[PDB]
Structures are given as structure tokens and as C-alpha cells.
């Protein structure tokens, strides 16, 4: 007597009128004239924006910093829209359209002569940011496959997550820190300048606490 169990119900769920991902423009409608500095800190460290679920229950979670150009947006849109079920699934963008101008110098020129002309636009992303959020009358197992395919093709480490798997990830990290048997931790040593270590550390390491190196996030660091 194989034991059946109640199936989850999505009767209360409601699908928006426009289920598919909208088109993202290559560049802003009004082109930016003022050229901007490189500002690499915009992809460094933990994300503070779009870290929580809003409408849907599934998403792709960033595990590193990087820039998303228009080519990436097209890969995400075409892959998700083609793979999703419009009747039962809806997808929203959790990242703005490319807005940061990247300059390039003409090929073959030497160093100097002023800054280069604007070439394309990118969207900076930090680790911990939800990039695309999906919802509807479906389970994570249904969308995990194609969401993982999209995540693999991003220019930074990424993984498809759900409300449950995302919370378990955070709970596991908190538990590891609480039950860690190493008496020495990066935070304690750095914040106290033990061994004069701050001579080889960045001021950002007081808050990054050894979990972030450049644009890379180390999930196994406690």
C-alpha cells in the first residue's frame, strides 16, 4: 500500500497579465553624455538591494559580483520565456536595465590623449542579489532546470534558489558560525588588529570579514 500524500494547491495563486519577461534596451533612451569613473566598488562586497523575494517564490541568486551587458539580458529573456509556461508561470526582472556607461578607446592607440568614448552600458550586480524572480502555479523542481541553465551562463557565480532553499542557506551559514570549533576567526583578528594584520588587509575587510575577495564570494568562509 504505497502511501500517497496531499498535493500542494495553487488555487489562491494569480498569474499577472504579462507573464513573460519584458524587453531590456541596450542603452538608456536618453544617452548619457558625462563619462564616469570605473568605480569597481559597485560590484564589490555584499548586496544591499534586491536581496529578498518580492512577488514570486523562485529566483536566481548571485554568488559573485559582475556586470550584465545587453547580451546577458537577451540570453536570460529568450531562455526563460521559451522554457516557461505562460499560463502557469510569470517572471519579473530584479535588475535594472544597463545604465553604467563603459568607455573604449579606438583600436591601436597609445596610452594618453584623454578618456575614451562611451561604447556600451552595463548593470552592476553584487553577490547576494536576486537577478530574476519567478512565480506562479509551479514547484521549484519544474523551474529549477532551466533557471540553472541560465545561471550557468551568467558572468558571475549564480544558482537557482527558492524561498525555502534560500532560507536554509542562510540558516546553515548561521549554524556553522555558531558551532565553529576554531577559536580564531577572521573577524576577531581583523577588528582587533591582532598581529598588526590590518597592514595587509583592506578597511573593507572589517565588514567583509574574509568572505569576499575582490568580486568573489566565498560561501564556506565563516
Amino acid at each position: 500500500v504505497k502511501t500517497l500524500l496531499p498535493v500542494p494547491s495553487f488555487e489562491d495563486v494569480s498569474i499577472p497579465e504579462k507573464p513573460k519577461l519584458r524587453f531590456i534596451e541596450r542603452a538608456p533612451l536618453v544617452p548619457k553624455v558625462r563619462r564616469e569613473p570605473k568605480n569597481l566598488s559597485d560590484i564589490r562586497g555584499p548586496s544591499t538591494e534586491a536581496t529578498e523575494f518580492t512577488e514570486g517564490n523562485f529566483a536566481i541568486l548571485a554568488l559573485g559580483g559582475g556586470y550584465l551587458h545587453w547580451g546577458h539580458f537577451e540570453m536570460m529573456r529568450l531562455t526563460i520565456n521559451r522554457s516557461m509556461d505562460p499560463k502557469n508561470m510569470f517572471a519579473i526582472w530584479r535588475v535594472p536595465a544597463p545604465f553604467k556607461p563603459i568607455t573604449r578607446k579606438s583600436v591601436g592607440h597609445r596610452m594618453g590623449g584623454g578618456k575614451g568614448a562611451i561604447d556600451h552600458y552595463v548593470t552592476p550586480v553584487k553577490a547576494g542579489r536576486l537577478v530574476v524572480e519567478m512565480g506562479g502555479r509551479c514547484e521549484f523542481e519544474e523551474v529549477q532546470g532551466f533557471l540553472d541553465q541560465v545561471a550557468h551562463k551568467l558572468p558571475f557565480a549564480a544558482k537557482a534558489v527558492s524561498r525555502g532553499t534560500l532560507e536554509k542557506m542562510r540558516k546553515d551559514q548561521e549554524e556553522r558560525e555558531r558551532n565553529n570549533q576554531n577559536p580564531w576567526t577572521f573577524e576577531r583578528i581583523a577588528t582587533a588588529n591582532m598581529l598588526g594584520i590590518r597592514k595587509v588587509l583592506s578597511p573593507y575587510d572589517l565588514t567583509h570579514k574574509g568572505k569576499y575577495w575582490g568580486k568573489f564570494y566565498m560561501p564556506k568562509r565563516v
Binding site: 579606438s106 592607440h109 594618453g112 590623449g113
Partner: peptide, 18 residues
């Protein structure tokens, strides 16, 4: 050898007022 451009930003050389 390619012929390069020039910077269009002039001025901005004032010293600090102390």
C-alpha cells in the same frame, strides 16, 4: 603608429585655498 585624440577638458588647475 595611430594618430590619437586630445582631451577636451581645460582649466581645473586651481590650487587649494588653505
Amino acid at each position: 603608429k595611430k594618430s590619437g585624440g586630445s582631451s577636451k577638458n581645460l582649466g581645473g588647475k586651481s590650487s587649494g585655498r588653505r
